Each structure stands twice: as C-alpha cells, then as structure tokens.
Design a protein around this ligand. Structure first.
Ligand SMILES: OC[C@H]1O[C@@H](O)[C@H](O)[C@@H](O)[C@@H]1O
Ligand SMILES: OC[C@H]1O[C@H](O)[C@H](O)[C@@H](O)[C@@H]1O
Ligand SMILES: OC[C@H]1O[C@H](O)[C@H](O)[C@@H](O)[C@@H]1O
Ligand code: NA
Length: 548
C-alpha cells in the first residue's frame, strides 16, 4: 500500500476512439507519465496536474498500463499506476461484479457504489434479486410499472433505484444484466398462464412438482419448469420483453439450481435438464436478439451442453469437490475445451465462506492468492459489488475488506486489465525449463505443492510468459480459504533464475501486482546458448516474466 498516488480514470473501459480522462489525487515534481503496451513505452509526457486526457490507440481489445515516475540523486520511483482496457464490447475480457441492494438508496450513494466498481474496471454488473418474481420479473405492466415492489425476501425494491443504477453503470461503460432463474415459479403465479404441462416433477405420474425449499424469510418455495418446454419458453420470452421495455438492461443473467437428480416431464419422460438449457438459450436470444445472455453452469452442470450456444462468455459457480487450486484451473481448462477456445470464463467462487457465517474481515492473503491463480490462468472472478461476496446469497455482507485488501485488490484488477492480452487472448500453456540460480526459490510446475513456487508458462505470439505463483508458505491448497487461515507469503527478493530458451532473447521484462503497482520493469539478462539468466526483484504472491 506504498503507492504515493492514487491514479484513476473516468470510465471502467473505453471503446476505440474514446478519450481517457485521468485523476491523480496529488502531484509531484520532476515526474513523467509513461503509457505502456505489453511492457513497451508508446507515449511519455510530463506529469503536469491532477487531471489530463489521453486518446489511446484505436486497435480493439487492447490493455495498457499507465505508470507515473519521479526522478529523485538521479534515481526514479514509481508513484502510481492504472490499467486501461480498450474493448468495443465486454465479452472478450469480462470483469463481472454485482449489485444486491435496490431499496431507497440516494443517487449519491448509488454513485459511490458504481464509482468504486469502476476503479476496479468492472465492465458489467449482475443485478441480483432486483426482480419481483422468478415467473414475472417485472412488477406491474409495461404501461403501468410498479414504482415499488417486494422481492423474494419481501424487502422493498425501488424502480427508480434499478433504473438509476442501470443509468449509472451505463455512464461508466458497464453492461447491466438482470438476474433471474431459467425456470423459476413462486407460489403466487397464475396457473392459467403456467400450465401443469410445463413443470418438472420428482415422479413420473406428474404427482409432486420438483421444488427448491426456502425457509423464512423467503416468501415461497421455488417450483421448477422445463427449459425446453416451448409454452414455457414463449411465456418467459414475454416476461423478458416486458422487463426490457421498462428497464434498460443489456441482457439476462440466467441462473439455475444445478443438478436436480432424476426429475420428469408432465408426460413422465426424463427432464434431463442439462440437455434442455441449449434450447432455452437459443429461444431466449431469438426473442431478444439485441440482448446479452450469460448462464451459470452450477458446479459445471450444463456447461458442456451450453458451451457452443449464444452466450457472451462462460460462467461457473464453483462448489465441492472442486475445492483445490488445481480444481479452479481445471474449470478454466475445461471451459476452454468445451467452448473450443471461443469464450473466456467468470468464476463465482465465494471466499472465506464458512467465516462469512458471522460478521468479520476477509482474510486478505486468501483473497489475493486465489485471484493470483485465477488471473494468471486467464480467468476472471465475480466478487465485487457494494461489498465482496462471502456467500451465494449476494446481499450477505457479513465480511468486510480491510483498507489494505481494497488497495491490493485494486492493483490486481489493474494488473489483469493491463495485461489481458497476455493472460486470456490466445496462446498455449507450456511447462518452462526454469531453475533457481541461488537457492532462494524452491521451484516446481503446476499444479502447486505447499512449500514451492509454481511456474506456469504460456506461449502468446512470439512471447514466452512465465508466471511464478508462491505456495512457499501455503498451509492449504484449498482456494476458498473457508476459515480465513491462509498465510501471507514472505517476500523473496532478487531471486536469480536460469531459463532454457532457444531463440535469441531481445528483452525480458517483469511485472507483478505486488511490486510497483504492476508497472513493467525491464531486467538485465545474459544468454549463453539456450541458457538465459536474470534476477526477479520481488515475489510475494504472483510475478510475471515476459521473454521477447
Ligand atoms: O488452462 C491451463 C492448462 O491448460 C492445459 O492446456 C495445459 O496442459 C495445462 O498444463 C494448463 O494448466
Ligand atoms: O438463496 C436464495 C436464492 O434462491 C434462488 O437462488 C433464487 O432464484 C434467488 O432469488 C434467491 O436469492
Ligand atoms: O457468442 C454469443 C453470440 O452468439 C451469436 O453469435 C448471437 O447471434 C449473438 O447475439 C451472441 O452475442
Ligand atoms: Na471490456
């Protein structure tokens, strides 16, 4: 939290040709703003005030880091950094957050929420439990929408807040996705509209409807309909249209309850929900072709089946037995394969889960290690809204983030924005041949081993990337850090590395969210044959080495 300046930009992301407006919280003398692309300086200018603008290069889907340097005795110091995403649309590089509270909140309170998210470069937002009813997400009618409604826990939801947040998210270049289930009905539905033939039953004689039981303070259990059923699809498409004509959501965050076991259609056939979802997705899209769709594969239920459908990117809510770091990276690897490398993924992976049964703090090194793995592997984490997620019920805010975690996490979002081209824009994973030169690092491959630094290589274009992920001081390899026990890694400094690399090396550079706000630092190096050596300045959680 050493950064002398907080450097922010006005929007979350920028379409090609949009102007970037910067704010620094304070100014220093004899300082230079450097604009970098993949470690290359593309622009330098004098740091001349707190507010200034930059027209970035117009090529689409491009991250940059901006770093301010002071000259002191002729040495320099990084003062502050900010990542910048130039994307036309969010789906290539999704940075998904949420919103959870839609009561009478002031415009300036909403602004502070959206602004904070913006500083993490959040590029769209899942609006969780904004809706009236699973089976009728719009309260009232299109011509007469209800200004205030009660949600599934009977709390008050204001139209003006929903509309307002949509407008605020829009002013910051963010997309707004409305939450609903694919197939939810609560007990006040109209039976003349959702007929008996549309439900899923736990037995074969259309006796007992399948249902997710919710106790107090929820108003109803959730009945389940068949996503493939055409009357259902047409019914809900009308509901979505209704919503879209009232609230200017960009699309529908489709949620579900995961594997229901053996369930039946009315007619006694097997409902086989994972093979019903593809049809549902296509029906939703064809009824609203200008609106976005993302669907949650709960613990990967449906994922193979849906990966080639009309989804912006893939999403996976992670549960047991997927609890290891190596299980997180397996979900990312699987989602690549299922989508034949067409779609990146967002992970809903609730940290400090057990601890969040009570008020407390998030365990900073757990949150950072987990995001260092996810972001190093080209994933993305839905974790931030008005607060950070501790539970699948998004409004729960039992755990707070320290000011240290806030700070750090801002630099991690900066890092994964700035270096998105290296992290999740094509290439192939490789196992680098790398060894400590000095004994300072105890080096292994991935998947990780407690006590060792795991090296992960990726060939992106003509670049070789090596990510160092520090498990030296890890006391579990469980991502969730459910009880907040994980350790803070000891710093390792000036660690000599040896790397086999045929092909002349032109430049090696380093960047770490744990060192100089992720600014790129060029390293010295020698090359004898295939043997290259160099020193990394710092490893805490996650360093990235780039060989060109
Ligand atoms: O998704 C990253 C994973 O991708 C696979 O292609 C590689 O073989 C693994 O080594 C790697 O961890
Ligand atoms: O856990 C309670 C949750 O159950 C379901 O996921 C509902 O769709 C959602 O509205 C509610 O928040
Ligand atoms: O991959 C998702 C995309 O699938 C198709 O190309 C749809 O027509 C488009 O609306 C959607 O965004
Ligand atoms: Na974007």
């Amino acid at each position: 939290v050493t950064a002398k300046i907080t450097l922010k930009t006005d929007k979350a992301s920028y379409k090609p040709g949009e102007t970037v407006n910067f704010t620094a919280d304070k100014v220093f003398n004899s300082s230079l703003i450097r604009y970098t692309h993949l470690g290359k300086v593309i622009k330098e200018e004098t740091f001349s005030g707190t507010s200034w603008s930059w027209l970035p290069p117009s090529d689409d889907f491009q991250g940059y880091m901006v770093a301010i340097y002071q000259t002191n005795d002729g040495t320099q110091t990084i003062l502050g950094t900010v990542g910048i995403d130039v994307s036309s649309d969010w789906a290539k590089f999704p940075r998904y957050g949420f919103l959870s509270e839609f009561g009478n909140i002031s415009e300036s309170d909403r602004a502070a929420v959206i602004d904070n998210l913006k500083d993490y470069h959040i590029n769209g937002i899942q609006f969780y439990d904004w809706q009236y009813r699973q089976h009728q997400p719009l309260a009232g009618t299109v011509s007469n929408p209800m200004p205030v409604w009660n949600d599934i826990i009977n709390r008050e939801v204001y139209g003006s807040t929903v509309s307002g947040y949509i407008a605020q998210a829009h002013s910051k270049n963010m997309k707004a996705m409305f939450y609903n289930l694919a197939y939810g009905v609560l007990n006040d539905y109209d039976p003349n509209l959702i007929k008996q033939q549309q439900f899923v039953y736990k037995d074969a004689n259309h006796n007992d409807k399948d249902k997710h039981e919710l106790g107090w303070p929820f108003i109803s259990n959730i009945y389940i309909t068949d996503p493939a059923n055409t009357a259902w699809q047409n019914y809900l498409a009308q509901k979505n249209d209704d919503v879209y004509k009232v609230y200017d959501f960009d699309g529908f965050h489709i949620d579900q309850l995961g594997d229901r076991g053996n369930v039946f259609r009315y007619d006694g056939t097997n409902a086989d929900l994972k093979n019903a979802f593809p049809s549902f997705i296509s029906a939703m899209k064809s009824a609203n072709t200008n609106k976005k769709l993302v669907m949650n594969a709960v613990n990967q239920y449906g994922q193979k089946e849906i990966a080639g459908k009309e989804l912006d990117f893939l999403y996976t809510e992670v549960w047991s037995p997927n609890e290891g770091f190596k299980d997180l990276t397996q979900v990312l690897t699987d989602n690549a394969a299922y989508s034949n490398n067409s779609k990146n993924t967002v992970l809903a992976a609730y940290m400090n889960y057990n601890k969040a049964n009570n008020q407390g703090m998030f365990n900073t090194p757990g949150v950072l290690l987990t995001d260092a793995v996810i972001f190093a592997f080209g994933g993305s984490h839905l974790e931030l809204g008005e607060h950070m997620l501790g539970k699948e019920y998004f409004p729960n805010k039992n755990l707070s983030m320290s000011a240290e975690l806030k700070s750090s996490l801002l630099e991690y979002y900066d890092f994964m924005t700035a270096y998105q081209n290296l992290l999740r824009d094509g290439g192939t994973y490789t196992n680098p041949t790398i060894a400590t030169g000095d004994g300072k690092l105890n080096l292994g491959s991935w998947p990780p081993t407690m006590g060792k630094v795991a090296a992960v290589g990726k060939q992106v274009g003509s670049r070789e990337i090596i990510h160092l992920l520090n498990f030296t001081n890890a006391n579990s390899l469980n991502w969730r850090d459910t009880d907040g026990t994980q350790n803070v890694p000891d710093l390792i400094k000036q660690a000599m590395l040896n790397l086999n690399h045929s092909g002349k090396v032109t430049k090696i550079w380093y960047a770490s969210p744990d060192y100089n706000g992720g600014a790129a630092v060029e390293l010295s190096f020698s090359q004898n044959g295939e043997k290259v050596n160099f020193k990394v300045p710092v490893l805490q959680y996650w360093a990235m080495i780039v060989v060109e």
